[PDB]
Symmetry: D2
Subunit: 248 residues, 4 copies
């Protein structure tokens, strides 16, 4: 079970991070929603009660994310779980002939900065916080769960920046679990296929073999709970995608 664990969930005001937060608070854990100030984190935290607060922060900022973890530890006393769901996406070709338009450097930089350098910023700063915990009966001090994408394996036309960023998450999964193994922190990544969140904001659903529909955010939340409960899952990437494989 996850009752009594404290989880910091980035991207927690919407979509997969918010559904994760609803499932873990409903199972008895406490959840901090780390999300930008312009989001609706504060209200969603209120709707989930006193065991779920909002920590406004941008994950590309060291000082903000350090302030958000300080808040979580001060309120709830420790951090057991982190879930990285903050992320953005763009759909721009590397070079579009017709328009003779190269993809800009700054649009690639921005997607790398939020998705991959923002996930590594959270990881590096929560790892020292979970390192303070007394190890449980099996030597574990924490679990860190990241969100990649099937775009890390079958990135479509227009997804070079998003793919680069999520393949970076996938490539650092095993070296960060091997770095944190001596202090008992597992590191696992989930790679969702196509899910019903805002991030889509009209024919995507038909491509999915079975179930033949977009994923429900609550199914990502149930895998997150399984990942936190299973003590031997480590250093691995799970696809959650209805058996889809993306075409160009």
């Amino acid at each position: 079970s996850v009752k009594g664990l404290v989880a910091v969930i980035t991207g927690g005001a919407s979509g997969l991070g918010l559904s994760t937060a609803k499932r873990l608070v409903g199972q008895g854990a406490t959840a901090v929603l780390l999300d930008v100030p312009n989001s609706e984190g504060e209200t969603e935290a209120k709707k989930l009660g006193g065991n779920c607060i909002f920590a406004p922060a941008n994950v590309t900022s060291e000082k903000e994310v350090q302030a958000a973890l300080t808040l979580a530890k001060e309120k709830f006393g420790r951090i057991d779980v982190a879930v990285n769901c903050a992320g953005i996406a763009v759909a721009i070709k590397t070079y579009h002939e017709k328009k003779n338009q190269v993809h800009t450097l700054e649009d690639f930089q921005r997607v790398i900065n939020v998705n991959l350098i923002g996930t590594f910023n959270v990881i590096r700063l929560v790892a020292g916080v979970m390192g303070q915990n007394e190890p449980d009966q099996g030597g574990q001090r924490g679990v860190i769960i990241n969100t990649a994408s099937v775009a890390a394996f079958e990135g479509q036309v227009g997804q070079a920046a998003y793919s680069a960023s999520k393949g970076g998450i996938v490539g650092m999964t095993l070296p960060i679990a091997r770095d944190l193994a001596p202090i008992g922190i597992r590191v696992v990544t989930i790679a969702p296929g196509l899910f019903a969140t805002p991030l889509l904001t009209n024919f995507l659903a038909s491509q999915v073999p079975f179930p033949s529909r977009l994923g429900d955010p609550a199914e990502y939340a149930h895998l997150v709970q399984m990942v936190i409960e299973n003590p031997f899952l480590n250093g691995e990437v799970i696809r959650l995608d209805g058996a889809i494989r993306m075409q160009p």
Copy 2:
């Protein structure tokens, strides 16, 4: 929840299949252990209670497999889940220079027949049974879970036959989930690393000294919780999951 579902677990008399049956029965499901007659199957299904029975069958036998699935459908009315855990292992080099010995073809064939063809034999026969189920609210008629190994990806010296059989399992997982998509049967494969079973249990704790964290052999109850997650989560399909403590196997 798995309360009420009927699962047939091949390899259910020992190790990972037996720990899966104990967890699923302790959570309210029914379980049929499918394992060879010599095994401890009968005893185990007795110690597990009236919601678990033993169906003697060798998975390389179409007739025996089909008889066990029919027993299950007779006793319990339907089959909702199948978990393939029957398997064998050998440690024989392709060519051993000290000995001057070449791996026999029959010792490769044997591993391939139990591990690979025997999992396909159970899959193909249980798909037609699950296809008799009424689809649930979300279109689902059944879930098939196979057990490969990390050896499908990092086979060590000595594991050509075992690696070939487990890579065959991994390679057929997506085309079988695509074949079954129209009738709502999910197909997922779990690839354990090293586990404390009557396959493993100085030769063994050297192996457990290589696991990053937790630093020890897997406990079969951890494989059984992964199998419960895979039954419960409706969107996991056509994928292979490593369950191994972050180990990568050296030669």
Copy 3:
């Protein structure tokens, strides 16, 4: 250069294996085409001249492959390379709901026996032949090249038996290269996408670029590069124009 080398190519009377044999003989190597007695192996070997012979053998047969390897080692003096291209395909659903048809166990067993058990049978018995060679200046005594398929990774509807056999090839590539490391035999597998051969001849249209079936001479070119590069080992290479298969 592959000049001088002796290769045994299973499935060499047709498609990929024959194009590979044309290229390697054209570059000065010797080739032994290992194929079933009913194929056109004798004529194909005759057309390539006296540096190319036919050794009729089914790769599932331990007696037949040992006699064809022995013919190669006697005729040419040694075996430096083995290319596994012998292979068959089927298109059968696991369970077909409209006809209420279960895939038969025999059709799955026959594809695994030719493609997977046959490729291991050639590897296991050519290894000890190559083990007789004096190592070259970098320790090498031989190179073994197997043929899998993109179906090991994106198997389509109807390909459960073929994907199982090609996923078995990929799976065993690294342990046999580990096994053979002490005697200097490299082991590499190619996973082609779709190639214009008698196994095949809108599939073409799905390949990003170039948008067409592959040409068997491009597979032959990638085989020569794997024979020439001393550091490629224990790896599977996709040769597929960037195709990813849909159901």
Copy 4:
């Protein structure tokens, strides 16, 4: 044959990039070495002769890469091949328990910026230059080859930034090949295991000397010329695309 093709090779003053230049120019091609100003660039470009020039440039700069490409296009008339070998490595734990030291954010940012954003900078700006060429008999306009690493799959302890940069190169290889398919530009990535280049001084020392033993066969560090031979194979084979090839002796990295 590579004869008469024009190749721009980033990181071309040393290691893999230089040995790749040496091989292509030995085989009849022209090569531009794109490397920083403080490297041996200019002297290598001289030793390699009249069909090899140095364009000093940092791959992280739009302006410098655009200028180096323009010089190649002005001086040889076209660009047929691009080879990304510019790269840096670091060995830093995400969080060090003994020393109680966290990996800095700017050290991870610097390796992602050189290795991954610097490789996409060159791709996107060379793509349009290759797109000026007329298509060959088979529809091809150019080939782009990138260098990742087996760290993209088995990153060791200390390699979080390096692995994240290299796994990002692997992750983008297919979407870029798909993006560039209409114009006939293949995109392939090579993931080298451990090679005898000057980069090697990144490992402990009590690590480095031992490396060879881990390599199954041949049981040694890779020779840079072996990397160069695989690059020529990728240039020549018209059907390789969208794929990553390990070149590593069958090694699998332990922690």
